[PDB]
PDB file of C-alpha atoms in Angstrom:
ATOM      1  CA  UNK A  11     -42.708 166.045   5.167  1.00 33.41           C
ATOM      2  CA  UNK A  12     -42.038 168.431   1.694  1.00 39.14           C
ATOM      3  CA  UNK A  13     -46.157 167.630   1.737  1.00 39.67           C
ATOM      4  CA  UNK A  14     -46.222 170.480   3.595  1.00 43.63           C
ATOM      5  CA  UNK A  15     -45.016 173.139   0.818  1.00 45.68           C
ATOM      6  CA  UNK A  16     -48.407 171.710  -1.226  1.00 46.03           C
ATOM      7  CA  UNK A  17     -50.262 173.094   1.884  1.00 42.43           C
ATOM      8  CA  UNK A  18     -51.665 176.235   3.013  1.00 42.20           C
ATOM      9  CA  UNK A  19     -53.982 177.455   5.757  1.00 42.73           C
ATOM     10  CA  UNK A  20     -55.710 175.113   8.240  1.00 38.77           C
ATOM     11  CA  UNK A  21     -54.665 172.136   6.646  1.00 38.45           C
ATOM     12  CA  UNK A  22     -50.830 173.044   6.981  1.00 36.65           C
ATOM     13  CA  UNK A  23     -51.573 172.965  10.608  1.00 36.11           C
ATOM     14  CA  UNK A  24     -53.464 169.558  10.764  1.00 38.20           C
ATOM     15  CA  UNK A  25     -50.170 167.167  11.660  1.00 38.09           C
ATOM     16  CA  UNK A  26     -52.846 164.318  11.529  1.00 38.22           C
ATOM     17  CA  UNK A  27     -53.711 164.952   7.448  1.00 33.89           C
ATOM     18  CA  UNK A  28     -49.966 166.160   7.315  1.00 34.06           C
ATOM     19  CA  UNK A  29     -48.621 162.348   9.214  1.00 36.31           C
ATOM     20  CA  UNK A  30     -51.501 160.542   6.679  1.00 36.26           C
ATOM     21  CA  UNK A  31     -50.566 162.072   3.293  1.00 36.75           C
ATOM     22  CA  UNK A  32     -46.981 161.137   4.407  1.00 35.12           C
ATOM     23  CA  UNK A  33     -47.608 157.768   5.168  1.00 35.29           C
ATOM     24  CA  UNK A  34     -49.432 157.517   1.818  1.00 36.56           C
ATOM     25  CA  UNK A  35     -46.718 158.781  -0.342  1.00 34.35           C
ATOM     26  CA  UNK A  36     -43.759 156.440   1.788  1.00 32.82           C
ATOM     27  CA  UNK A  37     -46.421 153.909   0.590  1.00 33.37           C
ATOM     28  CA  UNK A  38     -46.745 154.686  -2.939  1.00 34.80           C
ATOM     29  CA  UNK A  39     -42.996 155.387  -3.592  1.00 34.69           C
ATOM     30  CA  UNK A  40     -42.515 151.493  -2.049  1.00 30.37           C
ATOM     31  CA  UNK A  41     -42.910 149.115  -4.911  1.00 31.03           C
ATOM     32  CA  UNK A  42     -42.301 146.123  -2.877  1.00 31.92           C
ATOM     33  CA  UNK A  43     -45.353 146.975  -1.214  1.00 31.95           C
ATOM     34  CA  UNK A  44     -47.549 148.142  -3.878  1.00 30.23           C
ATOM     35  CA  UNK A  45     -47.305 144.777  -5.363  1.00 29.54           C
ATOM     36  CA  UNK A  46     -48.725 143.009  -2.300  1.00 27.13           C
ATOM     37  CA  UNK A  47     -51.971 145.346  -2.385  1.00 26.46           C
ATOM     38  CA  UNK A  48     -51.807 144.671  -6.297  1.00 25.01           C
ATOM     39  CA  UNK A  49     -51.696 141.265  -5.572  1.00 23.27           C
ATOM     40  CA  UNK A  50     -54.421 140.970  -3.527  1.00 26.74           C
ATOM     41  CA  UNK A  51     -56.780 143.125  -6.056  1.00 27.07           C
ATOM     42  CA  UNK A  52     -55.187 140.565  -8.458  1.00 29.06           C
ATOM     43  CA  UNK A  53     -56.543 137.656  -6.600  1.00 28.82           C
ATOM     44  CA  UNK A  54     -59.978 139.572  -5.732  1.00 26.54           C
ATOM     45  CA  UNK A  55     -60.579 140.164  -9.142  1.00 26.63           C
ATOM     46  CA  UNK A  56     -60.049 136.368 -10.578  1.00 31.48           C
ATOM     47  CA  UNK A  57     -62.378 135.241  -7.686  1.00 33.55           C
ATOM     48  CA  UNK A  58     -64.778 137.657  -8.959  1.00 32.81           C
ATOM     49  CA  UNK A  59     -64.442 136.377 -12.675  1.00 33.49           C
ATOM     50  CA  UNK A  60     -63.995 132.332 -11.770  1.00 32.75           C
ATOM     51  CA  UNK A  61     -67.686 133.105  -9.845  1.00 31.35           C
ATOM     52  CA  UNK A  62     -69.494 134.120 -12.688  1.00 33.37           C
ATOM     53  CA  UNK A  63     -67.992 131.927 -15.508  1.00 36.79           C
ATOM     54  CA  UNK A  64     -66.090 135.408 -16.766  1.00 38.55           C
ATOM     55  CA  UNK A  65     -62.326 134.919 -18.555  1.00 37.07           C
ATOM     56  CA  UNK A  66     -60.394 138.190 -18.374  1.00 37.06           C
ATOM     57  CA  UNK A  67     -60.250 138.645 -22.039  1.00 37.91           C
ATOM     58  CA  UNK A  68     -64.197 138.788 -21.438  1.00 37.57           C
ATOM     59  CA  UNK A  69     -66.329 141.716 -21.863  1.00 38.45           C
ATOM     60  CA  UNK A  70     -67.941 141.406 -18.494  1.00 37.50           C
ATOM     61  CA  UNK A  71     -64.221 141.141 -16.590  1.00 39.78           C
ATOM     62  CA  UNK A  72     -63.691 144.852 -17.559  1.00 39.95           C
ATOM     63  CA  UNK A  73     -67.525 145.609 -15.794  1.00 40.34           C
ATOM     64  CA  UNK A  74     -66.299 143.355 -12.700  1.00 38.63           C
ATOM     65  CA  UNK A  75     -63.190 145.212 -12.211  1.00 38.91           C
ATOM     66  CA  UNK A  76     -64.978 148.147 -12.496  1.00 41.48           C
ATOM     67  CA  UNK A  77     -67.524 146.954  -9.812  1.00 36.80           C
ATOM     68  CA  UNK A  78     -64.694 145.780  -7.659  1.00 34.97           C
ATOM     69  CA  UNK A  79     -62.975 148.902  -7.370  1.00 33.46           C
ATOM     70  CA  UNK A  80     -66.446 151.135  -6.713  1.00 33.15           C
ATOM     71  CA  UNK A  81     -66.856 148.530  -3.911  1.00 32.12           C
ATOM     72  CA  UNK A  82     -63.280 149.114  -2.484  1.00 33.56           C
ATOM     73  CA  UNK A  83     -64.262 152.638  -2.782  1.00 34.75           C
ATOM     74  CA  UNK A  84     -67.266 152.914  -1.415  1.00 35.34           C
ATOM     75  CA  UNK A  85     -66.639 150.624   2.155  1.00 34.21           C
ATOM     76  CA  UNK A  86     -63.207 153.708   2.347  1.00 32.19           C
ATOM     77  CA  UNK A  87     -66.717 156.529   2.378  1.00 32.66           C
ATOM     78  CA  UNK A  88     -66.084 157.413  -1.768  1.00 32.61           C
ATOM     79  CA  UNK A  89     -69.704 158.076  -3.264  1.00 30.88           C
ATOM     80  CA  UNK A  90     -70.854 154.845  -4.883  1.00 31.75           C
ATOM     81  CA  UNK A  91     -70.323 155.381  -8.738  1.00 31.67           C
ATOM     82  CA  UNK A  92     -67.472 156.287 -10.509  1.00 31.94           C
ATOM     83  CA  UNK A  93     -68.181 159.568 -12.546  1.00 27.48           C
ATOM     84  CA  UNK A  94     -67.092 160.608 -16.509  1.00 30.57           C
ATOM     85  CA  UNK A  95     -68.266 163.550 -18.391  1.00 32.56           C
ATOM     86  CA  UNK A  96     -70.633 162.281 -21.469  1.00 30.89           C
ATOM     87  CA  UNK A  97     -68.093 162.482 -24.262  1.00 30.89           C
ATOM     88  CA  UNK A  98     -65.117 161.960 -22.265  1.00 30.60           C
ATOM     89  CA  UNK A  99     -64.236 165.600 -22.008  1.00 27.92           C
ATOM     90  CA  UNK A 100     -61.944 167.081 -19.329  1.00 28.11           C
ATOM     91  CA  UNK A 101     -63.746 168.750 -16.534  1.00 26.64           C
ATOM     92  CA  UNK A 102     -62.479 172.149 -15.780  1.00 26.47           C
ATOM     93  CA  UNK A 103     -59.920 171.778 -12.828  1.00 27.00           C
ATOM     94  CA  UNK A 104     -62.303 173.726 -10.510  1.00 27.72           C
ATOM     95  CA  UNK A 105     -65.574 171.797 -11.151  1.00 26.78           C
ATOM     96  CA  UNK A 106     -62.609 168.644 -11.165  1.00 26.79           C
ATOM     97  CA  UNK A 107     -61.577 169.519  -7.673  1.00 24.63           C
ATOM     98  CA  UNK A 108     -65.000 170.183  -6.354  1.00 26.04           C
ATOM     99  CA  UNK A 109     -65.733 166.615  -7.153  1.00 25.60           C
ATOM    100  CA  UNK A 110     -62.916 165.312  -5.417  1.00 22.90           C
ATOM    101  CA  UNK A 111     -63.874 167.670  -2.122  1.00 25.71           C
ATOM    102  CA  UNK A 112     -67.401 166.336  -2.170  1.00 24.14           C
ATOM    103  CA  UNK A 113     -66.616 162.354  -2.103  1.00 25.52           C
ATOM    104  CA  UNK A 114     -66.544 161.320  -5.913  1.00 26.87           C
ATOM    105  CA  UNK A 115     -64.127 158.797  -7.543  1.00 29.56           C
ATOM    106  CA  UNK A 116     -63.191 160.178 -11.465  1.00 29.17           C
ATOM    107  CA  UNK A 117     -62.278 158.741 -14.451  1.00 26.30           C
ATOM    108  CA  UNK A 118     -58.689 159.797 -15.134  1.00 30.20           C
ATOM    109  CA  UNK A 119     -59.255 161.935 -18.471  1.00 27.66           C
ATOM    110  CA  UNK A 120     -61.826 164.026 -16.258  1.00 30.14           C
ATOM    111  CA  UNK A 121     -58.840 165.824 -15.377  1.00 30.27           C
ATOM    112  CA  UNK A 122     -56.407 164.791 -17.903  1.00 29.78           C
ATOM    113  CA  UNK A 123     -56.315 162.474 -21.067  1.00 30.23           C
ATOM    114  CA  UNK A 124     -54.017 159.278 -21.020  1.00 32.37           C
ATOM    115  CA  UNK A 125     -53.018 156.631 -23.380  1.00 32.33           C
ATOM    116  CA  UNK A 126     -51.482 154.860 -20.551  1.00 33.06           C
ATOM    117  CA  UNK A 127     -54.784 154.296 -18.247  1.00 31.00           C
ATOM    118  CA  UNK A 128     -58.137 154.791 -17.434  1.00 32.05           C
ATOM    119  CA  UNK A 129     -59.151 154.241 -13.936  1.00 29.23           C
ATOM    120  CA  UNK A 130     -55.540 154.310 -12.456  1.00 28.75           C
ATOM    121  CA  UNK A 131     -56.145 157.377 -10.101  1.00 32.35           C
ATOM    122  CA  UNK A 132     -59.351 155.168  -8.601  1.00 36.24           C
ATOM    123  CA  UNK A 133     -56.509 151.980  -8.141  1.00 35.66           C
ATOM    124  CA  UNK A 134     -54.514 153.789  -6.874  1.00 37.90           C
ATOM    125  CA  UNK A 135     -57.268 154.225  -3.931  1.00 37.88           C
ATOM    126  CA  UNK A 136     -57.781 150.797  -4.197  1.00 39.73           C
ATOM    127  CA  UNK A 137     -54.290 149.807  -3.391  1.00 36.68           C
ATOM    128  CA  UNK A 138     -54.125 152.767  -0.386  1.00 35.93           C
ATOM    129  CA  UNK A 139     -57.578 151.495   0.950  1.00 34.42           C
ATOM    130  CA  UNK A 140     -56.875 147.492   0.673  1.00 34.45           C
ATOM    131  CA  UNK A 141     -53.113 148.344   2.696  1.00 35.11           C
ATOM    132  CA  UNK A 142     -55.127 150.102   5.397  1.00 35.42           C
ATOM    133  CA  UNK A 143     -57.577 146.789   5.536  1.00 35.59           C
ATOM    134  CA  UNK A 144     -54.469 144.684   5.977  1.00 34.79           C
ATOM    135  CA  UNK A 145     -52.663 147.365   8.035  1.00 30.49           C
ATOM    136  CA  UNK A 146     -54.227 149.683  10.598  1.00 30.06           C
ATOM    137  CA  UNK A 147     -50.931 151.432  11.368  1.00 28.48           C
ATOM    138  CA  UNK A 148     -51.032 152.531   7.789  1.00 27.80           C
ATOM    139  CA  UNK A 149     -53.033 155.556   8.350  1.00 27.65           C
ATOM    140  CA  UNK A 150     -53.033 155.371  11.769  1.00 24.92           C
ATOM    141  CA  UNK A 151     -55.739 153.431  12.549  1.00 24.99           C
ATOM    142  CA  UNK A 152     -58.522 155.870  11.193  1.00 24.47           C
ATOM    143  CA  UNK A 153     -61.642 154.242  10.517  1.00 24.81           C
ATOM    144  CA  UNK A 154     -62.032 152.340   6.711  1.00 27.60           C
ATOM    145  CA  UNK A 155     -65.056 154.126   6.218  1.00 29.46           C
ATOM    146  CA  UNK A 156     -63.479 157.597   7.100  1.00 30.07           C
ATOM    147  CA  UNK A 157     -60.724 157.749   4.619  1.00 27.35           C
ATOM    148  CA  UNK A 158     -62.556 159.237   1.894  1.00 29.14           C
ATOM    149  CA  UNK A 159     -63.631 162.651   4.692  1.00 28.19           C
ATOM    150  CA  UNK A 160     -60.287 162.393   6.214  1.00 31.14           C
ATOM    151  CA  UNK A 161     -57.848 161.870   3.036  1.00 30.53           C
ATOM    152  CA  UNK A 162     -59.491 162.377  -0.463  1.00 25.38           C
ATOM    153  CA  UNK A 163     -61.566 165.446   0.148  1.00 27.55           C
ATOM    154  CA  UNK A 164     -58.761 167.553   1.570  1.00 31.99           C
ATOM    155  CA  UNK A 165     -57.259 166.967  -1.744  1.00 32.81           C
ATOM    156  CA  UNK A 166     -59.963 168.810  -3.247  1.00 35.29           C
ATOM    157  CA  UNK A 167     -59.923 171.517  -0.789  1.00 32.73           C
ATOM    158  CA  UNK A 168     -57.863 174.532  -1.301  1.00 30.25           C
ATOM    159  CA  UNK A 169     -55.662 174.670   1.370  1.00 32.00           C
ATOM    160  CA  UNK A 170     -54.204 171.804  -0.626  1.00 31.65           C
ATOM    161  CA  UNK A 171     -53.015 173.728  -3.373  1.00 29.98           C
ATOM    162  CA  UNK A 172     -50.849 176.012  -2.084  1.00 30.12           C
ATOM    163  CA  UNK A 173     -49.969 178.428  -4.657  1.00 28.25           C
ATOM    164  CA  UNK A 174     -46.391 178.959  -4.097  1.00 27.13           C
ATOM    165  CA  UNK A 175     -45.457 175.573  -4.976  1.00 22.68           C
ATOM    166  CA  UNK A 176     -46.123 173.811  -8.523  1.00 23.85           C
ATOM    167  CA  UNK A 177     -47.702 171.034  -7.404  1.00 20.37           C
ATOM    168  CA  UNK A 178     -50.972 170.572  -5.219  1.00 18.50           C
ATOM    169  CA  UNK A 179     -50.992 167.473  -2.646  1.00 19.21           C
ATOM    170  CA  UNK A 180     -53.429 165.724  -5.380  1.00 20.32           C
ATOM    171  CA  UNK A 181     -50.170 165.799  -7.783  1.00 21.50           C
ATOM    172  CA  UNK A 182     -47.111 165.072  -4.953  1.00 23.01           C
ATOM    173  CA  UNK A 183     -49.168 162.190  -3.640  1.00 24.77           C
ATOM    174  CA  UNK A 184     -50.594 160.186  -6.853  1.00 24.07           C
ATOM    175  CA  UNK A 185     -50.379 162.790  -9.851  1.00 25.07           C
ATOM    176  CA  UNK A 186     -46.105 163.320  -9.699  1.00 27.47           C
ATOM    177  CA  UNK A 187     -45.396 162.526 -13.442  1.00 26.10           C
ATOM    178  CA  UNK A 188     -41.753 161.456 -13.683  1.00 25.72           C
ATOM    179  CA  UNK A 189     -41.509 159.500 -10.883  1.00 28.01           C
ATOM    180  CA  UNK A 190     -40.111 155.552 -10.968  1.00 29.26           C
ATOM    181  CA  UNK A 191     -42.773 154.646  -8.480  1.00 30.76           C
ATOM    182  CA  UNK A 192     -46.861 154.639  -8.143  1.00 29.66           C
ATOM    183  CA  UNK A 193     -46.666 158.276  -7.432  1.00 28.32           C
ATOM    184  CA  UNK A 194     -46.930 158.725 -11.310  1.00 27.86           C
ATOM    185  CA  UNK A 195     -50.031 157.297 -12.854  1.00 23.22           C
ATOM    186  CA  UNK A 196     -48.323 156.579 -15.972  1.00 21.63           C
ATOM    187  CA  UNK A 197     -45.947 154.555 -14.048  1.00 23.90           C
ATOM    188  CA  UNK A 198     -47.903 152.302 -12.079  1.00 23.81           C
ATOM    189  CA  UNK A 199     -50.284 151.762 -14.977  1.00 24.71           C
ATOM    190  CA  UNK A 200     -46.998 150.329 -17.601  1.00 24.52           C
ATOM    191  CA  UNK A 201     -46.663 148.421 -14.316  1.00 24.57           C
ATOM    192  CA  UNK A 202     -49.410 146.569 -13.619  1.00 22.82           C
ATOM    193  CA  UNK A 203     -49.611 145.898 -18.244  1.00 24.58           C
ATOM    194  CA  UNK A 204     -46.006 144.877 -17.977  1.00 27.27           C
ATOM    195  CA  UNK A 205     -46.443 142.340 -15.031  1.00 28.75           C
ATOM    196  CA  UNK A 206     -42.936 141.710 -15.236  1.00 24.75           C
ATOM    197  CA  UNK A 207     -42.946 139.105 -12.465  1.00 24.70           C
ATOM    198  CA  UNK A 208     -46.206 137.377 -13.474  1.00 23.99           C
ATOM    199  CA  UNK A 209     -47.671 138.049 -10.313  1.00 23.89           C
ATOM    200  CA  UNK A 210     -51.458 139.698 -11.524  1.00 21.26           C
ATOM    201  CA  UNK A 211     -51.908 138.476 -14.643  1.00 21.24           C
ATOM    202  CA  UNK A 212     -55.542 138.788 -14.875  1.00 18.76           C
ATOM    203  CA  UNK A 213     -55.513 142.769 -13.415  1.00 23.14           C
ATOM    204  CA  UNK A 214     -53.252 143.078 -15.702  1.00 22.06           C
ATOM    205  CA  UNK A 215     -55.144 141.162 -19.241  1.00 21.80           C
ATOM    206  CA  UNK A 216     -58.611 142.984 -18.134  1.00 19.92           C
ATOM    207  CA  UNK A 217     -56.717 146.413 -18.023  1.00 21.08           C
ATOM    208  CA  UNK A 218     -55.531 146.080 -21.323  1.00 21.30           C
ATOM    209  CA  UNK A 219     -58.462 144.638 -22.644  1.00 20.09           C
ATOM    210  CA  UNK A 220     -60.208 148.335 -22.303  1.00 24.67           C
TER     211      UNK A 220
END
């Protein structure tokens, strides 16, 4: 668990956060299944858009996508809306983190500008939240609705950020740039726009389409 040189305090001593942010990143660094979770949004998503007379090229597929991941969010505890600053401006990291500690789901260039993606820290959530829904064992069977108190806010906590090592928890588990796996942002985001295997096309044409 090399989680644990991210941690300080009591949250280096909780082995249940320390045995779910492990499980998470054994998750994330496992393509194979990362695609089924992808999938499934995938196949959410084009039932969404098939409802409502919507093609993904659409305006309105990027606002059900949108609305499909703040639901995902929300039923995992995640404060229902996702925020931005007006402008688009970076947040501070401190008034960033105390965001994250109290529940909220952030644009990514609230933290940190990217050509490569937009909302790809929230789907990351998304694919963490829907493995859970197919797989208790995943995080251990904690409750859906408790992953947000359990998980995300701890990231935003201090104790998560342990200074002696350059990376916080937030950054080992889904910020590790350089990474061939959906650890990195900027890797699962040329992913899921590649779609090398043609298996979400329409995640993958709305994404692009913003």
């Amino acid at each position: 668990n090399p989680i644990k040189r991210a941690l300080q305090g009591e949250l280096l001593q909780n082995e249940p956060f320390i045995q779910l942010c492990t499980k998470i990143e054994n998750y994330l660094m496992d393509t194979e299944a990362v695609n089924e979770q992808l999938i499934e949004l995938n196949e959410q998503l084009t039932m969404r858009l098939k409802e409502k007379g919507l093609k993904p090229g659409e305006k309105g597929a990027t606002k059900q996508l949108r609305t499909l991941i703040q639901e995902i969010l929300t039923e995992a505890g995640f404060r229902e809306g996702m925020l931005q600053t007006i402008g688009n401006k970076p947040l501070a990291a401190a008034d960033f983190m105390f965001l994250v500690s109290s529940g909220f789901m952030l644009k990514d260039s609230s933290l940190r500008a990217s050509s490569h993606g937009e909302l790809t820290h929230a789907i990351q959530w998304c694919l963490i939240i829907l493995k859970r829904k197919k797989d208790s064992s995943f995080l251990e069977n904690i409750p859906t609705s408790e992953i947000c108190d359990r998980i995300y806010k701890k990231l935003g906590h201090q104790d998560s950020s342990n200074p002696n090592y350059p990376f916080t928890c937030w950054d080992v588990l889904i910020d590790k740039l350089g990474e061939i796996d959906s650890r990195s942002p900027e890797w699962l985001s040329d992913h899921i726009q590649n779609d090398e295997d043609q298996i979400f096309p329409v995640l993958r044409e709305v994404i692009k389409n913003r």
